[PDB]
Each structure stands twice: as structure tokens, then as C-alpha cells.
Design a protein around this ligand. Sequence first.
Ligand SMILES: Nc1nc2c(ncn2[C@@H]2O[C@H](COP(=O)(O)OP(=O)(O)O)[C@@H](O)[C@H]2O)c(=O)[nH]1
Ligand SMILES: [Mg+2]
Length: 181
Amino acid sequence: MAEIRRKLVIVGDGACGKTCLLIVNSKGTFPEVYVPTVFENYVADVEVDGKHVELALWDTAGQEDYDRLRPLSYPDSHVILICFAIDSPDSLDNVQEKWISEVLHFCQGLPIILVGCKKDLRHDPKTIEELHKTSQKPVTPEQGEEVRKKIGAYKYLECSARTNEGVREVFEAATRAALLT
Ligand SMILES: Nc1nc2c(ncn2[C@@H]2O[C@H](COP(=O)(O)OP(=O)(O)O)[C@@H](O)[C@H]2O)c(=O)[nH]1
Ligand SMILES: [Mg+2]
């Protein structure tokens, strides 16, 4: 009749898992071989709280000219996902140092969901050994929440595209936030 439509943009450091998160949500299977730099614009059907919502998914990047093109993704958004990877504390530090200022510049007043990706790596032995070489460790859930509070984000959620853990909750949270906007 007239489906409810909302727009989502997802941003965050390169290789933090944005495109795979979109693919798993949309297509349902983790891509083991070919991953595009950005997912195709796609409209997701999200069932939340008894409503069918169409959520347009806008993927972004920074390599090449994608940084320059990124601002063209923000207009008329309803919800922003700022992502980092749990196996990369550097990518969490970039949330405050780079991403929040960008998002607030272009999307003042929109709800932001902070998303910790690659949850499956939190106890992964190779990840733990790699990070021990620079006296680092995986991001903890508390660390993610503390960043959420610092940036005024609407919610903090963790997920793993590889195991699919927490993916539905991400998009259900984002849709609920978008419906308020
Ligand atoms: N272990 C693990 N690896 C992931 C996950 N999501 C993405 N990857 C890997 O991380 C890399 C970057 O993923 P991608 O979605 O392209 O990151 P983007 O640059 O943020 O779009 C790829 O090698 C993926 O296979 C995840 O949930 N867990
Ligand atoms: Mg990508």
C-alpha cells in the first residue's frame, strides 16, 4: 500500500567488517572468497515490533575515491552505524578521533548505533597472540560501552558476520531507531 521506508548508512575503518555484515544480513551467507569493496545498494526487509520496514542499506569505504564519495551517502539518512572490529583496538580509537566528527558534521541529530564487529575473534588464539606483540588485547564489551557513552551513541551492539551472532539484533535496533527519526 505504502511500505514504511528508512535509510541506513554504515561507516568505519577499512576491513572492520562492514560489507560482510551487510551481505550476511541481506543474502544470508558469509562470503568466503570474493568480497566487494562496497555492497550493492540494497533494500532490506526488516520485521520489527509487528511492522514491515524497508531499510535502504548504504555501504561506504575510504580507499581510492571512496572517501571523497562518502559524503554523498549521508543525505536523508535515518540511522547511522559506526563500526569497529573487536580484534582491532586501533579501529575503536578511530571512532572518537575520526568517525564521530564526520558523522556529526553530516548527520546532526540522527541516532548512531555503535557496532563492534568480528566478535568471534575475541578469544581467537591467533588474534590474541598477534595483539600481545604490541601489549594489546581484543576490545572488551565494557570498552565498547565506554566509547558509546563518550560519543553519545544510541546503543552499543556486538556481532559476528562469520557466525551470524548478533546480526539480526543490529538491524532490528537500527530499524527501531530509524522509526523514531
Ligand atoms: N573473523 C571474521 N572475519 C570477518 C568478519 N567480517 C568480516 N571479516 C573479514 O574481514 C575482512 C574485511 O571484511 P569487509 O566486510 O570487506 O570489511 P569492510 O572493509 O569494513 O567492508 C575480510 O577478510 C573478511 O572476511 C567476522 O565477523 N569475523
Ligand atoms: Mg567494504
